[PDB]
């Protein structure tokens, strides 16, 4: 439940930021955070902390 919550939060934030318009750098960092969230959802602890 907590991991799904994290993924949904980050997805909503990135969707908003794309719709509202933002510089490429912020969008790229948000996509990185989404990637890390999904990686943690599927296999927690395989990469990084």
């Amino acid at each position: 439940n907590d991991l799904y919550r994290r993924v949904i939060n980050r997805n909503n934030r990135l969707k908003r930021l794309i719709d509202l318009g933002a510089p490429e750098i912020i969008v790229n960092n948000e996509k990185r955070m989404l990637q890390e969230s999904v990686d943690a959802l599927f296999d927690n602890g395989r990469r990084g902390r």
Partner: protein, 112 residues
């Protein structure tokens, strides 16, 4: 040229970050390098229980835009302040500056 850069910060706490950044630039008195630090904040409205009410949302939520010339001393100074994770850029050794067009866009919105 004081190209704009973005520094991440802990969620929530943002104002303390900017204020401490100003104080720390005072401390080392490198005023000819740091020019301006702003946290854009639009004001919108919502109806809570059938009543129009105000609200204050900071678009680009969680980051702080700052002016900085690219000197490693400035790099350490910015990285040193509390509650500042790091520089969001193209690589750690040197951050990446946001293009003038994006800063023009945010200036237009903040004006509006």
């Amino acid at each position: 040229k004081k190209r704009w850069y973005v520094v991440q910060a802990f969620s929530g706490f943002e104002g303390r970050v900017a204020t401490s950044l100003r104080e720390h630039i005072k401390l080392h008195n490198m005023e000819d390098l740091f020019g301006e630090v702003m946290v854009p904040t639009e004001e919108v409205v919502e109806i809570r229980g059938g009543q129009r009410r105000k609200s204050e949302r900071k678009f680009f939520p969680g980051y702080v835009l700052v002016q900085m010339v690219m000197n490693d001393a400035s790099w350490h100074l910015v990285r040193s302040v509390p509650r500042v994770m790091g520089f969001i850029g193209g690589t750690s050794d040197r951050p990446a500056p946001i293009s003038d067009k994006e800063v023009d866009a945010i200036m237009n919105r903040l004006q509006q």
